[PDB]
Amino acid sequence: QDLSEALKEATKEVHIRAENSEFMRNFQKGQVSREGFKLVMASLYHIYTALEEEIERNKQNPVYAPLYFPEELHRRAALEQDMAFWYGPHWQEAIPYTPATQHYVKRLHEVGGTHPELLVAHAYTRYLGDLSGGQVLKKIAQKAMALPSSGEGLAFFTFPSIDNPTKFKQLYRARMNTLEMTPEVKHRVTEEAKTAFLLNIELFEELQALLT
């Protein structure tokens, strides 16, 4: 069984739970406000910063290298633009760093520094989602908060280097299938993907509570 199919199969159940989280459920209803949106994007800023730091650390490592797509996928730069938009010129010392966000970042550094063969699970979970449901969320956000079609405030959801998200995802899945695979690595990569999804769910549950 190809890794791409193993991952989709392994995370299909938890994905349902994730997309139905209270925060996401509200977001999908169009019920999303500046306060809540700023909290989640600031949290993603920290998460992608950690993820991409570990990707750079392991860019030449065979267990990840085939999936090294900084130009097409990396979100750090985009998130910095969004942080300046939502939090202003000095967003650096204004943005929050919640406990659940810190927990996610902690696991990312553990994986990147100690278990790099599992990094693919984290890139898969975040990037492929951004190119899927994230695109629907972008449209909901624009309508709900009156964000311009020009993109300001939603740079994170925009991929100027990817003409067709659907085609790119197919390319990415194919590339994941070229990674050196053994039963041990395949088993743990799918388990780590489940963990990645749980870290996201816990983040959303935390943000929803903070807003409430």
Which residue, 55 or 128, has its beta carbon nearer to ligand HEM? 128
Is there a binding annotation on residue 173? yes
Among 127, 129, 36, 52, residue whose Cα is nearest residue 86: 36
Tokens matching residue 91:
């967003």
Which residue, 83 or 141, has its beta carbon nearer to ligand HEM? 141
Which residue, 128 or 189, has its beta carbon nearer to ligand HEM? 128
Which residue, 94 or 209, has its beta carbon nearer to ligand HEM? 209
- Nearest-CB residue for ligand HEM: 133
Q: Contacts with ligand HEM in 25-64 (CB under 6 A)?
A: 28
Q: How far is the CB of 82 from ligand HEM (least distance, A)?
A: 17
Task: Give the whole-angstrom CA distance, residue 144 versus residue 155.
Answer: 16
Q: How far is the CB of 136 from ligand HEM (least distance, A)?
A: 5
Half-sphere exposure of 192 (CA within 13 A, CB side): 24
For residue 67, the Cα-to-chain-centroid distance in whole angstroms is 15
Q: Contacts with ligand HEM in 113-172 (CB under 6 A)?
A: 124-126, 128-129, 132-133, 136-137, 169
User: Looking at 12-20, 45-53, 144-152, 177-185, which segment touches ligand HEM (CB under 6 A)?
Assistant: 12-20
Instruction: State yes or no: residue 111 binds ligand HEM (CB under 6 A).
Output: no
Is there a binding annotation on residue 124? yes
Q: How far is the CB of 169 from ligand HEM (least distance, A)?
A: 5
Neighbours of 4 (CB within 10 A): 18
Q: Could you tell me which residues are annotated as the binding site?
A: 8, 15, 124, 173
Q: Could you tell me which residues are annotated as the binding site for heme b?
A: 8, 15, 124, 173
Name the site residues for ligand HEM (rule: CB under 6 A).
Answer: 7-8, 15, 18-19, 24, 28, 124-126, 128-129, 132-133, 136-137, 169, 197, 200
